Amino acid sequence: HHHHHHGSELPQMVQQLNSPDQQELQSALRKLSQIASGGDEQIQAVIDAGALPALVQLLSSPNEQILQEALWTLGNIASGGDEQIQAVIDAGALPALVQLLSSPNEQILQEALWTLGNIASGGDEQIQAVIDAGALPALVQLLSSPNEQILQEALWTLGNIASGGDEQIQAVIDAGALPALVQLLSSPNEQILQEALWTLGNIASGGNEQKQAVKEAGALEKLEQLQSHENEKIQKEAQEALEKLQS
Ligand SMILES: [Ca+2]
Ligand SMILES: [Ca+2]
Ligand SMILES: [Ca+2]
Ligand SMILES: [Ca+2]
Ligand SMILES: [Ca+2]
Ligand SMILES: [Ca+2]
Ligand SMILES: [Ca+2]
Ligand SMILES: [Ca+2]
């Protein structure tokens, strides 16, 4: 598409996020999400127009049509630079995001997990905020989910968190992730095995204390077994995870 210089148009769209006309509101929210899907430059224009605090208030809305679009906007902003991610944090998104991990609406749940995952793909500061906001217990609980679509998104977000510093990995371990991940390594669903290996791999690349807890949990047995799985992608992923574990 096309270069557009957003004038005063962008702060004006932001104002309509507090309009009592939901059709104006939705229109603005749609345009913002489309903007936010561009690069870091487009994202920055949305931040600089003051969109973050208006978006965050919409995360309390009982209107799922508004909420889904606001989440999508925030997830996209969080796909930017670490400071763009921090902006989202600084605007108070995380408490609402964590409380949305309890939604019975799977579409909302997934969007919230996705957004969280994006924020957690940031630097150690951004990951720490996710941890401090109490995301881990819900995340570990979702590893027991029978909804494979939700499971994959929870595994990805955990994986991102476990891409942080050793104490951040330890945080994941202290929340109980290892037993759930080890159980997942016996799934007869190879898609799940791959997703679990990615996450477990990340954990296994922490320091000695994290590497040891990985062994205490029973992962080596499973990893060694999976070295010879029929599926050559799984073989490669179990090999990568085992190699990471042993550095
Ligand atoms: Ca109205
Ligand atoms: Ca720029
Ligand atoms: Ca509703
Ligand atoms: Ca439902
Ligand atoms: Ca990153
Ligand atoms: Ca299912
Ligand atoms: Ca400790
Ligand atoms: Ca199978």
Author numbering: 4 to 250
What did the authors write?
The armadillo repeat serves as a scaffold for the development of modular peptide-recognition modules. In order to develop such a system, three crystal structures of designed armadillo-repeat proteins with third-generation N-caps (YIII-type), four or five internal repeats (M-type) and second-generation C-caps (AII-type) were determined at 1.8 Å (His-YIIIM4AII), 2.0 Å (His-YIIIM5AII) and 1.95 Å (YIIIM5AII) resolution and compared with those of variants with third-generation C-caps. All constructs are full consensus designs in which the internal repeats have exactly the same sequence, and hence identical conformations of the internal repeats are expected.
The crystal structures of His-YIIIM4AII and His-YIIIM5AII were refined at 1.8 and 2.0 Å resolution, respectively. In both cases the asymmetric units contain tetramers with 222 point symmetry and very similar topologies. The quaternary structures of His-YIIIM4AII and His-YIIIM5AII are governed by calcium ions that connect neighbouring chains in a zipper-like manner and the His6 tag that binds to the supposed peptide-binding site, albeit in different orientations (see below). The His-YIIIM4AII tetramer contains 16 calcium ions. In contrast to many natural calcium-binding sites, where all coordination bonds are approximately equal in length, the His-YIIIM4AII calcium-binding sites are distorted. In His-YIIIM4AII the axial calcium–ligand distances are shorter than the equatorial distances (axial distances 2.1–2.2 Å; equatorial distances 2.4–3.0 Å) and the Glu25 OE2–Ca bonding distances differ significantly from the average coordination bond length. The His-YIIIM4AII tetramer is further stabilized by interactions between the N-terminal His6 tag and the supposed peptide-binding site. Since all four chains of His-YIIIM4AII are very similar (r.m.s.d. of 0.28 Å for residues 14–246) these interactions are equivalent in all four subunits of the crystallographic tetramer. The structures of His-YIIIM4AII and YIIIM5AII represent extreme cases that are most different.
